[PDB]
Amino acid sequence: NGQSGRMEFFWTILKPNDAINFESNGNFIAPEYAYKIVKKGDSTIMKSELEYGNCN
Amino acid sequence: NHFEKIQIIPKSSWSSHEASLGVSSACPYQGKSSFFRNVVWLIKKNSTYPTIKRSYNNTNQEDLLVLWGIHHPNDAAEQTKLYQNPTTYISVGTSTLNQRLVPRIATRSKVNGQSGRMEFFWTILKPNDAINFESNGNFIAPEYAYKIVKKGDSTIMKSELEYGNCN
Amino acid sequence: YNNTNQEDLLVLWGIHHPNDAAEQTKLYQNPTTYISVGTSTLNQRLVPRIATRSKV
């Protein structure tokens, strides 16, 4: 995509009342927006080329 | 099915380093600060931590289980407070093992009253094989190893029950 | 090296782990060394590990 550099992204699950600490003197891709897991349930990642059909 | 604990590195052989000050409140024993009994937390002596070069040759006839570890401090100040060397390493080697551990310094939430971490490692030392430890700090030196004196069929069963005095 | 060929290329390389710092200077004269390999997908940096090991 016109770039020889690379971005290596990492993730972790931060449990309630736990703290995540960052110390960096360079090359830091600092987080801005996180995600809250407000509802857990039975889901899946389906691999298909189709799109919405406005049905049930 | 059975282990046999042997002393591979005596606690009193650490002349150049402090071996009896590696305790913390996180591991109490009868109201006193203590540590894991099968490893030794070495501390700098007289503000110096000379490079460690210790080796053990498995003169036994059985496979040997050796446990050691590395201590990850909280900040640069604690590293100088305990080992006096800003950059340290632990190199471990056998016929197959080739390992070099570098302490990772990061701010972490307190767990059991401590923010530091103890990362432990292991290897199987075959007979007539020797394990070599070189470290200039952050070394959790082994004291006792485990001899595998009887192999067989067993398992690790997850249950809340306890002994019932039955056959 | 550029894979001007039309087929997939399996490339092999390696790193040397010496016995002590004396051999490192004896063979390469540089105490701290590295090996960086990069492709469109690979981003690897190897650092030699110096330790005392049994003879094989």
Automatic annotation (TrEMBL), chain A:
Belongs to the influenza viruses hemagglutinin family. The lineage of its organism: Viruses, Riboviria, Orthornavirae, Negarnaviricota, Polyploviricotina. Binds to sialic acid-containing receptors on the cell surface, bringing about the attachment of the virus particle to the cell. This attachment induces virion internalization of about two third of the virus particles through clathrin-dependent endocytosis and about one third through a clathrin- and caveolin-independent pathway. Plays a major role in the determination of host range restriction and virulence. Class I viral fusion protein. Binds to sialic acid-containing receptors on the cell surface, bringing about the attachment of the virus particle to the cell. This attachment induces virion internalization either through clathrin-dependent endocytosis or through clathrin- and caveolin-independent pathway. Plays a major role in the determination of host range restriction and virulence. Class I viral fusion protein. Responsible for penetration of the virus into the cell cytoplasm by mediating the fusion of the membrane of the endocytosed virus particle with the endosomal membrane. Homotrimer of disulfide-linked HA1-HA2. This is Hemagglutinin. It is found in: Host apical cell membrane; Virion membrane. In natural infection, inactive HA is matured into HA1 and HA2 outside the cell by one or more trypsin-like, arginine-specific endoprotease secreted by the bronchial epithelial cells. One identified protease that may be involved in this process is secreted in lungs by club cells. Palmitoylated. The gene is HA. Signal peptide: none annotated.
UniProtKB/TrEMBL annotation, chain C:
In natural infection, inactive HA is matured into HA1 and HA2 outside the cell by one or more trypsin-like, arginine-specific endoprotease secreted by the bronchial epithelial cells. One identified protease that may be involved in this process is secreted in lungs by club cells. It comes from the Viruses. Signal peptide: none annotated. It is found in: Host apical cell membrane; Virion membrane. Binds to sialic acid-containing receptors on the cell surface, bringing about the attachment of the virus particle to the cell. This attachment induces virion internalization of about two third of the virus particles through clathrin-dependent endocytosis and about one third through a clathrin- and caveolin-independent pathway. Plays a major role in the determination of host range restriction and virulence. Class I viral fusion protein. Belongs to the influenza viruses hemagglutinin family. Homotrimer of disulfide-linked HA1-HA2. This is Hemagglutinin. It comes from Influenza A virus (strain A/Vietnam/1203/2004 H5N1). The gene is HA. The chain holds residues 180 to 235 of 568 of the full protein.
